[PDB]
mmCIF file of C-alpha atoms and ligand atoms in Angstrom:
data_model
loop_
_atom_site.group_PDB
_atom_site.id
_atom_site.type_symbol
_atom_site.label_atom_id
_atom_site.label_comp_id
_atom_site.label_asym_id
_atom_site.label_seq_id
_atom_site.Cartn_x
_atom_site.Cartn_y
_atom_site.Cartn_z
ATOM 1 C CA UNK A 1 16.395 19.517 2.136
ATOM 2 C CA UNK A 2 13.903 17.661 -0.414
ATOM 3 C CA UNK A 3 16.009 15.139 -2.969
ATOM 4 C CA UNK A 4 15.661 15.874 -6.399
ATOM 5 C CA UNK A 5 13.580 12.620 -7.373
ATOM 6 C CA UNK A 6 10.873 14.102 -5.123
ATOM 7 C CA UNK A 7 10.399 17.493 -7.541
ATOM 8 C CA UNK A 8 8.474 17.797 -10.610
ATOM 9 C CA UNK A 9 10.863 19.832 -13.436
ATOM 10 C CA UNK A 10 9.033 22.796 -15.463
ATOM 11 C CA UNK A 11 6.431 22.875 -12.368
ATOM 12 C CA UNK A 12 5.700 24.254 -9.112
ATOM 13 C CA UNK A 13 5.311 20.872 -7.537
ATOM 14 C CA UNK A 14 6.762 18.105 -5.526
ATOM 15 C CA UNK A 15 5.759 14.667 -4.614
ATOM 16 C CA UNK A 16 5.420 12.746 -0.865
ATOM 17 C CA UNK A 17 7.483 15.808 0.488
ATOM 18 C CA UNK A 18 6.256 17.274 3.507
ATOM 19 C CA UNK A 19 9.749 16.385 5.898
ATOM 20 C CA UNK A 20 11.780 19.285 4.739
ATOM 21 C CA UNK A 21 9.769 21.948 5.754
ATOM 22 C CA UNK A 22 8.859 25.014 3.254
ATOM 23 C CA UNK A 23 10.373 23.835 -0.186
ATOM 24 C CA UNK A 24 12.012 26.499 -2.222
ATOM 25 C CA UNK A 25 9.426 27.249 -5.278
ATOM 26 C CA UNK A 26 6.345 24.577 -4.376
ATOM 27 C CA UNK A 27 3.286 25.884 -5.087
ATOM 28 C CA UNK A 28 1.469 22.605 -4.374
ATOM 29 C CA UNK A 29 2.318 19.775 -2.775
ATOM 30 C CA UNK A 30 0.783 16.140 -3.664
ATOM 31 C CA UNK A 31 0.575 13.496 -1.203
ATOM 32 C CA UNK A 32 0.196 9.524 -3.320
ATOM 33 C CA UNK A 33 -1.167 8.041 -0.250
ATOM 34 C CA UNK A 34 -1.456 7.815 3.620
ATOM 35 C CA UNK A 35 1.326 5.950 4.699
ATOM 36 C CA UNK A 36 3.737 7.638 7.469
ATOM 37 C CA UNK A 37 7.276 7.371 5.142
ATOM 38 C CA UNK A 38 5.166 9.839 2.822
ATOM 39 C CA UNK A 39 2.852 12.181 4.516
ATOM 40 C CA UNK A 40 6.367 12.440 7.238
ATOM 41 C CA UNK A 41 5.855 16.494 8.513
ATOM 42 C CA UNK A 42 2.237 16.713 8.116
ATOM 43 C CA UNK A 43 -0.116 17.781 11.082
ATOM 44 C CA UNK A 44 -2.393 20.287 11.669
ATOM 45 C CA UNK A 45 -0.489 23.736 11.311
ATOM 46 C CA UNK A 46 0.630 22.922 7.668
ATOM 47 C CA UNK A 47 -0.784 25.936 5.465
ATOM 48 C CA UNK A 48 0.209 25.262 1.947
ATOM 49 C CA UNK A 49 -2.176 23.170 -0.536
ATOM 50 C CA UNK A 50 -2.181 19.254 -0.487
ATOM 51 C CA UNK A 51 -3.772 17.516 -3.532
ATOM 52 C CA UNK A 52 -4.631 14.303 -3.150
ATOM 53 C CA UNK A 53 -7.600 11.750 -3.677
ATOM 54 C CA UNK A 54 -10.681 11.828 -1.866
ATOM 55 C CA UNK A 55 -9.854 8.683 0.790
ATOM 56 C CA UNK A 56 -6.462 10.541 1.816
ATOM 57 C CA UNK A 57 -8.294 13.692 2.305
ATOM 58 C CA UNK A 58 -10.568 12.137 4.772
ATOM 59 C CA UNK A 59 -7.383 10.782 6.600
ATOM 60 C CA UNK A 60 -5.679 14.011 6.866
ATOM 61 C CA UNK A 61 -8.973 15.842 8.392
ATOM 62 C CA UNK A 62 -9.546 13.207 10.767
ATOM 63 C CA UNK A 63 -6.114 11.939 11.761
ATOM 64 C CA UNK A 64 -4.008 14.666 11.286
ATOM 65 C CA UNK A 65 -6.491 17.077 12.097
ATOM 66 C CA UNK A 66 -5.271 19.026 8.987
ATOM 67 C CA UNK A 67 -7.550 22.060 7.945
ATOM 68 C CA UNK A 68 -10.092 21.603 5.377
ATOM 69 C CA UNK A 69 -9.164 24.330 3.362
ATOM 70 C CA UNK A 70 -5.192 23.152 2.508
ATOM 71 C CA UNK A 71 -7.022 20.270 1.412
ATOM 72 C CA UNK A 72 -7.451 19.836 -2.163
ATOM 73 C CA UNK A 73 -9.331 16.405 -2.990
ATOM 74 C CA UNK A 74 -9.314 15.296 -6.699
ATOM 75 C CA UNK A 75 -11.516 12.240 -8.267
ATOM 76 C CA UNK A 76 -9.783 9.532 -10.405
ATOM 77 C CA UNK A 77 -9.644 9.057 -13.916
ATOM 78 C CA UNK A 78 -10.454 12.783 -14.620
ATOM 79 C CA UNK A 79 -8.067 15.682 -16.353
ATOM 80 C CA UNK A 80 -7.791 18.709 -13.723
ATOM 81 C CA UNK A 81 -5.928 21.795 -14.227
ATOM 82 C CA UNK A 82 -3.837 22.302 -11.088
ATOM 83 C CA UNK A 83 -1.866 25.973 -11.171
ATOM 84 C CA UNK A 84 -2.388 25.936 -14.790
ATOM 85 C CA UNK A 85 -0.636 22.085 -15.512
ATOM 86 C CA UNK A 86 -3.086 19.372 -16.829
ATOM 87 C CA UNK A 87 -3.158 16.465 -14.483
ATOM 88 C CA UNK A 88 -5.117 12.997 -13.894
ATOM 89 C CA UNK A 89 -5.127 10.673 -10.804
ATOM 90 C CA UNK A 90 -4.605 6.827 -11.157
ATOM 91 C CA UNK A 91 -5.907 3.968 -8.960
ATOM 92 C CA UNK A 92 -1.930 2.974 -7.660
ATOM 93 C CA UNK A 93 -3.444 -1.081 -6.882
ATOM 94 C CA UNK A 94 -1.378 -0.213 -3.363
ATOM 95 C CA UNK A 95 -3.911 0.823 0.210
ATOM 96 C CA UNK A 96 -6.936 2.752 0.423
ATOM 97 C CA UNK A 97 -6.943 5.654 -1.570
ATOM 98 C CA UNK A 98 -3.741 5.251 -3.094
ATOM 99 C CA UNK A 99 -2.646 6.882 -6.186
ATOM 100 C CA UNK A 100 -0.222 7.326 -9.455
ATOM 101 C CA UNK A 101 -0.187 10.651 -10.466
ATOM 102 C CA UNK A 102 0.431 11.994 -14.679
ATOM 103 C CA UNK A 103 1.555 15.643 -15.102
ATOM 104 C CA UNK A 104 1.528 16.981 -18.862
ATOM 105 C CA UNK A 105 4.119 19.809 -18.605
ATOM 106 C CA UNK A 106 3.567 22.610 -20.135
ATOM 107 C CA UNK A 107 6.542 21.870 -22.634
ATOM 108 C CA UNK A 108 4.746 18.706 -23.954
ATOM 109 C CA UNK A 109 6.872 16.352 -21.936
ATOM 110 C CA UNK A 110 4.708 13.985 -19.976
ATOM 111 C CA UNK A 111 5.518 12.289 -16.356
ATOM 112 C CA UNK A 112 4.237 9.297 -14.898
ATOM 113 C CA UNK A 113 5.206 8.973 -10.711
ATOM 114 C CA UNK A 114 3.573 5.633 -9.529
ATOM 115 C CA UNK A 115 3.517 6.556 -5.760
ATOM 116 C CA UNK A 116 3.844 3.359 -4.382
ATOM 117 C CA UNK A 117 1.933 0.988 -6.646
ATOM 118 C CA UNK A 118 1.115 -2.623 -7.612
ATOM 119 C CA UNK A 119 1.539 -2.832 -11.324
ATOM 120 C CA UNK A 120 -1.343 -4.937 -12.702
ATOM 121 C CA UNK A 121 -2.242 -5.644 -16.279
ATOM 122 C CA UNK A 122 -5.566 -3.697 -15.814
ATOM 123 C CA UNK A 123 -3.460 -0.457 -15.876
ATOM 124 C CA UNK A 124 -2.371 -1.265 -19.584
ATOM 125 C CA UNK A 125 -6.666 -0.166 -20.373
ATOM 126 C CA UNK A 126 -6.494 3.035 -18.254
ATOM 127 C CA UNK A 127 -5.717 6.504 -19.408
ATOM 128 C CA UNK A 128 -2.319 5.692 -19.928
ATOM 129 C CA UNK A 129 -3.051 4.099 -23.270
ATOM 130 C CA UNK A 130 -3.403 6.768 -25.328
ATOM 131 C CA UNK A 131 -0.128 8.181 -25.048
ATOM 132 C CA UNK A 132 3.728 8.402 -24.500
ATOM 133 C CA UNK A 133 5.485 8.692 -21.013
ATOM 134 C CA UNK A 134 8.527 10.853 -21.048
ATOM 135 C CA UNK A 135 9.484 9.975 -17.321
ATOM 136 C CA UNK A 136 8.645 7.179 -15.266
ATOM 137 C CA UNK A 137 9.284 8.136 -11.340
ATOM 138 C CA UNK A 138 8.978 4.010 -10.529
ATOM 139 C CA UNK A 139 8.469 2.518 -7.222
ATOM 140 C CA UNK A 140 11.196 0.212 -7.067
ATOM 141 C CA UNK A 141 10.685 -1.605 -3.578
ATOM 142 C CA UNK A 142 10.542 -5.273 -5.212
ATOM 143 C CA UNK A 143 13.183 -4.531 -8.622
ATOM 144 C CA UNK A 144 14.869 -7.900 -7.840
ATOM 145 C CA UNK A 145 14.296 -11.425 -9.527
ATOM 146 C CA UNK A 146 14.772 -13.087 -5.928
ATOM 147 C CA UNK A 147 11.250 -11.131 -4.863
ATOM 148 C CA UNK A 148 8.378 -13.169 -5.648
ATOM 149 C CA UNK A 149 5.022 -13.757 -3.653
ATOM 150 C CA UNK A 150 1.474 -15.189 -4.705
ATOM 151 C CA UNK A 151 -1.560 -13.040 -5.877
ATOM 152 C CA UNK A 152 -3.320 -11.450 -3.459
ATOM 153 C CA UNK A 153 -6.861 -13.590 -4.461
ATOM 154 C CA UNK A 154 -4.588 -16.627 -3.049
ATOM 155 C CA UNK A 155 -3.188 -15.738 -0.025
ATOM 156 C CA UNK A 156 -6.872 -14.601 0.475
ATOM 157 C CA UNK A 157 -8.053 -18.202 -0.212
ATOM 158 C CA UNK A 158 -5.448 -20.041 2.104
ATOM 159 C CA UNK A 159 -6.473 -17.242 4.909
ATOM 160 C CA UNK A 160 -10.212 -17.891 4.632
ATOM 161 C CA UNK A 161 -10.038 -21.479 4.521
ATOM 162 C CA UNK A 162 -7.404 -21.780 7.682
ATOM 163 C CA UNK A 163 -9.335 -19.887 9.687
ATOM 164 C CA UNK A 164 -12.401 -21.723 8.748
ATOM 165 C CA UNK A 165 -11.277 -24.858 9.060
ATOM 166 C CA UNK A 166 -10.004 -24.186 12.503
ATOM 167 C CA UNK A 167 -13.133 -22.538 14.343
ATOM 168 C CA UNK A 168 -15.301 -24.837 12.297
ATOM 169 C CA UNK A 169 -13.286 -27.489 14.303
ATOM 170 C CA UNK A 170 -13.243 -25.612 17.428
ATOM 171 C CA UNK A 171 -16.457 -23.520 18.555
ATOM 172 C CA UNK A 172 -14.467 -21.553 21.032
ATOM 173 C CA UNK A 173 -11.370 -20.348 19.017
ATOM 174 C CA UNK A 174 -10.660 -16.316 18.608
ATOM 175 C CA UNK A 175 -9.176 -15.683 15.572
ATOM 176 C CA UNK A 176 -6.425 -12.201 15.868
ATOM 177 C CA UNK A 177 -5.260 -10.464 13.036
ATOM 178 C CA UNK A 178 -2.364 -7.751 12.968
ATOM 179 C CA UNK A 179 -2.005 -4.220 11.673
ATOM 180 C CA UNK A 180 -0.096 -1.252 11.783
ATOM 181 C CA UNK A 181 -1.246 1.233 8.756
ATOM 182 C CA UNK A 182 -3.942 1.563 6.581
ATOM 183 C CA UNK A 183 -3.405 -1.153 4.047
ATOM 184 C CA UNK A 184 -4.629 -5.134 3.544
ATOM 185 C CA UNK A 185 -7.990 -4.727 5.301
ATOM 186 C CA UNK A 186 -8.966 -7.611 2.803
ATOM 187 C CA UNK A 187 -7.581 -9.797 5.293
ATOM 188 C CA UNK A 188 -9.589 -9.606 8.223
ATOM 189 C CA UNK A 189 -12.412 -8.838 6.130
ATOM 190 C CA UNK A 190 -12.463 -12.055 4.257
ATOM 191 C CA UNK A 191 -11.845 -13.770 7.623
ATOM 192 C CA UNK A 192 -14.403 -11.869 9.447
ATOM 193 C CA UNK A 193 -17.374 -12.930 6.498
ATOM 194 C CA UNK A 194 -16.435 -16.555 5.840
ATOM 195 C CA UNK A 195 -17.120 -16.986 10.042
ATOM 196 C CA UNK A 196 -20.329 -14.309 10.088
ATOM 197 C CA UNK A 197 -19.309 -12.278 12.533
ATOM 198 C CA UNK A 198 -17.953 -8.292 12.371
ATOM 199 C CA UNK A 199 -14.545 -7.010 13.154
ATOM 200 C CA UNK A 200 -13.531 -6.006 16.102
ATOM 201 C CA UNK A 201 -10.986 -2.989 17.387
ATOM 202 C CA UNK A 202 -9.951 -0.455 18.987
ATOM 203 C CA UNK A 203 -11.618 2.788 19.050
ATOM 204 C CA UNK A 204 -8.379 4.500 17.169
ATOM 205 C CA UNK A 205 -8.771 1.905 14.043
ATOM 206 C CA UNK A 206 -12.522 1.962 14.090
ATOM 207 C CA UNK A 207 -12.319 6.010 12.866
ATOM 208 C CA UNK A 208 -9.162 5.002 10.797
ATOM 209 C CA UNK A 209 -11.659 2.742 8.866
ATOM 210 C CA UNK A 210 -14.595 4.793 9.027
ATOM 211 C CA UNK A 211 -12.290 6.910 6.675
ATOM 212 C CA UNK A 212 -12.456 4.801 3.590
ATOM 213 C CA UNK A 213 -15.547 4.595 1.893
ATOM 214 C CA UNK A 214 -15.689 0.515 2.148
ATOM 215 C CA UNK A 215 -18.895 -0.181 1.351
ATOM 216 C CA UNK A 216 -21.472 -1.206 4.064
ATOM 217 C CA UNK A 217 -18.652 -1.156 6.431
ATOM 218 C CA UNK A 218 -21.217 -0.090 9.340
ATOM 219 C CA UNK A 219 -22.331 -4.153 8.560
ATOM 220 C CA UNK A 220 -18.801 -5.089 8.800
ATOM 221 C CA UNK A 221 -16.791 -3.900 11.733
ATOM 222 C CA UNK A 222 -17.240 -2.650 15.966
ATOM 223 C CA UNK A 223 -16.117 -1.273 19.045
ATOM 224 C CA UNK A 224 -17.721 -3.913 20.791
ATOM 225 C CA UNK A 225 -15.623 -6.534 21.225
ATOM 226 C CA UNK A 226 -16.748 -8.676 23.024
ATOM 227 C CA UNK A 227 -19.552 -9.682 19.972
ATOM 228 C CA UNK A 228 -16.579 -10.267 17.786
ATOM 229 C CA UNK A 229 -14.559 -13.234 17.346
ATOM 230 C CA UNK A 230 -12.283 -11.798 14.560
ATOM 231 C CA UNK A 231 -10.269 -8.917 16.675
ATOM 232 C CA UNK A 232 -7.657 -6.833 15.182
ATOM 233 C CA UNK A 233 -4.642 -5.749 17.259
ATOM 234 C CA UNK A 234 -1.314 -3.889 16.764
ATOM 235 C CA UNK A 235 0.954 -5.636 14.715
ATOM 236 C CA UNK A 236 3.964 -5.577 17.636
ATOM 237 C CA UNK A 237 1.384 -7.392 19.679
ATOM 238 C CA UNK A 238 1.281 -10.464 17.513
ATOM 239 C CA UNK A 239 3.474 -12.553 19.667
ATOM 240 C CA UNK A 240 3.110 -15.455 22.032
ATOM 241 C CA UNK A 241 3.484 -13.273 24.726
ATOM 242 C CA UNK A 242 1.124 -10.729 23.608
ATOM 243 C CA UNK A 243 -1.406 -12.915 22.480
ATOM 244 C CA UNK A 244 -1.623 -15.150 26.176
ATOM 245 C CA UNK A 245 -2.100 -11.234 27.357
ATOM 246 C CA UNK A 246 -4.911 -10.786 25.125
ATOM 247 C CA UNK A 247 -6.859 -14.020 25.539
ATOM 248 C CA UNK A 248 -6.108 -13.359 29.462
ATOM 249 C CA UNK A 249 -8.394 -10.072 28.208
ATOM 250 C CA UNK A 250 -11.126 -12.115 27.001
ATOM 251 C CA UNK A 251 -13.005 -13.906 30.152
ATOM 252 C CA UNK A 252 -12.759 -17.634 29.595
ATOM 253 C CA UNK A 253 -14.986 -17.088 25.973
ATOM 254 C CA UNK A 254 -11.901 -18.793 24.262
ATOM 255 C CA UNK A 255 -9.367 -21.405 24.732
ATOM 256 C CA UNK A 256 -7.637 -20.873 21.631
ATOM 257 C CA UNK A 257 -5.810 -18.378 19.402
ATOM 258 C CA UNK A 258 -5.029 -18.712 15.466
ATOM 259 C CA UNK A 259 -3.314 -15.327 14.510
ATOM 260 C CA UNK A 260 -2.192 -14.002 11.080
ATOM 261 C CA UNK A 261 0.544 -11.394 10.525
ATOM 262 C CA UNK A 262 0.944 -9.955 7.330
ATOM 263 C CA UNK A 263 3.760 -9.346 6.060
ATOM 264 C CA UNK A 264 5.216 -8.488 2.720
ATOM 265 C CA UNK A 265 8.432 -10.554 0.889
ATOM 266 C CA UNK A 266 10.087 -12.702 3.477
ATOM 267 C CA UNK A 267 13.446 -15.357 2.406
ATOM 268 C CA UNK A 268 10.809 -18.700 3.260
ATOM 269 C CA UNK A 269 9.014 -17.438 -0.193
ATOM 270 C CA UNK A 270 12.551 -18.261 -1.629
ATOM 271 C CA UNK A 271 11.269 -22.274 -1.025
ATOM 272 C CA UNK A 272 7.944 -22.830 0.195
ATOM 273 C CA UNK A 273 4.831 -22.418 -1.762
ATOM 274 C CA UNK A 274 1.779 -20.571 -0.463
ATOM 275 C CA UNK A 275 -0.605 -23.756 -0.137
ATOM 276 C CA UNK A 276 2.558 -25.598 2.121
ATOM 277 C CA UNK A 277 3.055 -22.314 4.460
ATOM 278 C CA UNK A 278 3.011 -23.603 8.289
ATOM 279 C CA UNK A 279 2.478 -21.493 10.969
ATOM 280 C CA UNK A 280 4.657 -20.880 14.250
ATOM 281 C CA UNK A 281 2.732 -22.903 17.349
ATOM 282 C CA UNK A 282 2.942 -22.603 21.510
ATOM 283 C CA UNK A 283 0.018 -24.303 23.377
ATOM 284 C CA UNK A 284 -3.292 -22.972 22.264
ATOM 285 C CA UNK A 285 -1.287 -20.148 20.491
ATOM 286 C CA UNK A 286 -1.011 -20.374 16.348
ATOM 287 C CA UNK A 287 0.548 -17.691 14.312
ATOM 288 C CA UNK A 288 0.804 -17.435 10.552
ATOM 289 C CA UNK A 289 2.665 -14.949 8.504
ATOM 290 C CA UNK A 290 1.300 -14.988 5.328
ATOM 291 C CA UNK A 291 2.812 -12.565 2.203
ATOM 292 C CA UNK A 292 0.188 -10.321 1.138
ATOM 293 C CA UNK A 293 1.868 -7.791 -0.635
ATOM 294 C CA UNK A 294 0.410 -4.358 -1.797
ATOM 295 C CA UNK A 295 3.595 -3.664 -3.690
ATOM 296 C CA UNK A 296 4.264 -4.873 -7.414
ATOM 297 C CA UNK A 297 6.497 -8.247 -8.081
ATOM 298 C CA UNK A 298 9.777 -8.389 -9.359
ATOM 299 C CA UNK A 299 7.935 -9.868 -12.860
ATOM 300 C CA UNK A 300 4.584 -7.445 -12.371
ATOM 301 C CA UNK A 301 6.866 -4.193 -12.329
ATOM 302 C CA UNK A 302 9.073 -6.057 -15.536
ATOM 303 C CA UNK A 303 5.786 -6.426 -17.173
ATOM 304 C CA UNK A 304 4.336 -2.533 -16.642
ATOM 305 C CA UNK A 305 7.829 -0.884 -17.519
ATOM 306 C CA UNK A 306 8.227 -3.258 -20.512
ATOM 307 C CA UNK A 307 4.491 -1.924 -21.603
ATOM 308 C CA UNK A 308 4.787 1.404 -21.284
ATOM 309 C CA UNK A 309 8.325 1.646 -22.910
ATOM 310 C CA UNK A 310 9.204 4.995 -20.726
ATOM 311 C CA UNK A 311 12.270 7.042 -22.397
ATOM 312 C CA UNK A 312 14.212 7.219 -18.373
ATOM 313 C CA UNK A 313 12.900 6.014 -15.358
ATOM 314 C CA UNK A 314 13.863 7.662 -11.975
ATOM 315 C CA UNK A 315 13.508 4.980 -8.796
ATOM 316 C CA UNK A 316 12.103 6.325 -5.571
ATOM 317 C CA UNK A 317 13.071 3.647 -3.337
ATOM 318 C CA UNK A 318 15.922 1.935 -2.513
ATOM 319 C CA UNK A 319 18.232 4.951 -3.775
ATOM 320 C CA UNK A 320 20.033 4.927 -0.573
ATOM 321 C CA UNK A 321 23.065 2.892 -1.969
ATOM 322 C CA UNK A 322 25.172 2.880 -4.863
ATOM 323 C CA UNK A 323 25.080 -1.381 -5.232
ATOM 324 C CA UNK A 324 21.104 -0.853 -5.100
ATOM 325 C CA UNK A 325 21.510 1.930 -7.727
ATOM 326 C CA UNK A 326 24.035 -0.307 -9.781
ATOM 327 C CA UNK A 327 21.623 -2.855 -9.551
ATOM 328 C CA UNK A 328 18.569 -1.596 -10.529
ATOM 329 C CA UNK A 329 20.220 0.311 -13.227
ATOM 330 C CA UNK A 330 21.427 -3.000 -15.114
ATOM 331 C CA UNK A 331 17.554 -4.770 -14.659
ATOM 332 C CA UNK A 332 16.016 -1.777 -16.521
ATOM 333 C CA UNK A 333 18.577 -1.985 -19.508
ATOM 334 C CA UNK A 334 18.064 -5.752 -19.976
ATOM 335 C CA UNK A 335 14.686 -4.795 -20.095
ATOM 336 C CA UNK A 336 14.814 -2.602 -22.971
ATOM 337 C CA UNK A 337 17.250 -4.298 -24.656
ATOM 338 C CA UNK A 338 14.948 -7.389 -24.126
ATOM 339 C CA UNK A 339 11.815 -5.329 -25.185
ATOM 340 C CA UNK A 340 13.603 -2.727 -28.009
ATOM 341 C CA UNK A 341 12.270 0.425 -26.812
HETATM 342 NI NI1 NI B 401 3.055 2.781 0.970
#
């Protein structure tokens, strides 16, 4: 049975809830983004209508195999009337084809849910300028001071300049990076351009990416592995023990490995900075976890809520305990106490 901070009040709708089978009174059900925790009960014999954005509707034709006429695309940054409720689509700032979603009720309250998002100060110019939010359905996966990472642009700058350093050095070193969703890609991508050479990958991921509208990413990716030296493999693989397997794969092209596993948060952000990070190393084997995060900041998600001065805020993640309720309860008060909405 769907939770409560996955329905829309005054509508016909819910949110990311697809698990819990036909949901008493939805009349359309909207899917933020193509990540498993949220499209969970999808597949191909689902008959009720899915709006979403363009980029997920590609996903759930292709990977779900999902009928094209439960799916109900929707462009960004434009008011739509959806079973008579005005609504607009939001670039979330989270993986391809992510998005927020605003409903203006019919009763003149007006509801902001984020999906998941990461909050950026370009959101403060969108379409959420020009008026009040009534609710604010927040994703609260970082709402603790403790969580803090770099900006994406600098993790992307240590990334490109390991790897380039180190095949620059040595000729015959593969670079491997990890994966396991859609999500990131600027990774490998940046990797894959700063040593001229495509991405390489399993057939599965190839049609995963051929999904996203990337730009000239025909120029930019392959099948063909074996006229890549950037591969991409499954994140469980990126091991010492799965990467000797791999090079094993390879036919004496390469004599070295330098990996890169993204992850989000992780406690060695707690000291180290991201210029000093070090990676873990076993013969011709280097891995690096590096915290490229698609989810707002402790101090990014202060910042948004702070801005938009919502009346309540409902959290969608970490709800599963009453100390992480407690908690996240107390952080938005100081905030508007702090703020003096
Ligand atoms: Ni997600």
């Amino acid at each position: 049975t769907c939770p409560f901070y996955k329905k829309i009040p005054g509508t016909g709708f819910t949110v990311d809830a697809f698990q819990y089978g036909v949901v008493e009174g939805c009349t359309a059900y909207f899917l933020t983004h193509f990540h498993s925790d949220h499209y969970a009960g999808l597949s191909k014999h689902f008959t009720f209508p899915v709006y979403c954005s363009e980029i997920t509707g590609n996903l759930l034709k292709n990977k779900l195999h999902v009928q094209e006429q439960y799916i109900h695309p929707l462009p960004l940054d434009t008011e739509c009337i959806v079973n008579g409720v005005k609504v607009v689509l939001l670039d979330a700032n989270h993986c391809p084809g992510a998005v927020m979603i605003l409903f203006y009720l019919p009763n003149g309250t007006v509801i902001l849910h984020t999906g998941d998002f990461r909050a950026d100060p370009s959101m403060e110019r969108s379409l959420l300028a020009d008026q009040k939010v009534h609710m604010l359905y927040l994703d609260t996966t970082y709402c603790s001071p403790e969580y803090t990472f770099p900006s994406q642009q600098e993790v992307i700058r240590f990334a490109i300049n390991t790897a380039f350093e180190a095949v620059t050095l040595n000729p015959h070193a593969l670079v491997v990076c990890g994966t396991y969703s859609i999500g990131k890609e600027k990774v490998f991508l940046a990797i894959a351009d700063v040593l001229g050479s495509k991405v390489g990958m399993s057939q599965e991921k190839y049609k995963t990416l051929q999904c996203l509208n990337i730009p000239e990413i025909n120029s930019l990716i392959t099948t063909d592995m074996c006229s890549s030296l950037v591969h991409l493999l499954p994140m469980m693989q990126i091991n010492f023990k799965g990467l000797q397997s791999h090079l094993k794969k390879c036919g004496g092209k390469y004599n070295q490995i330098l990996a890169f596993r993204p992850t989000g948060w992780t406690h060695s952000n707690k000291f180290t900075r991201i210029a000093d990070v070090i990676p873990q190393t076993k013969g011709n084997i280097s891995i690096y976890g590096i915290p490229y995060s698609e989810h707002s900041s402790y101090l990014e998600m202060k910042r948004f809520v702070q801005w938009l001065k919502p009346q309540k805020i409902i959290p969608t993640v970490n709800v599963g305990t009453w100390k992480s309720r407690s908690t996240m309860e107390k952080y938005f008060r100081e905030w508007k106490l702090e703020a003096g909405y």
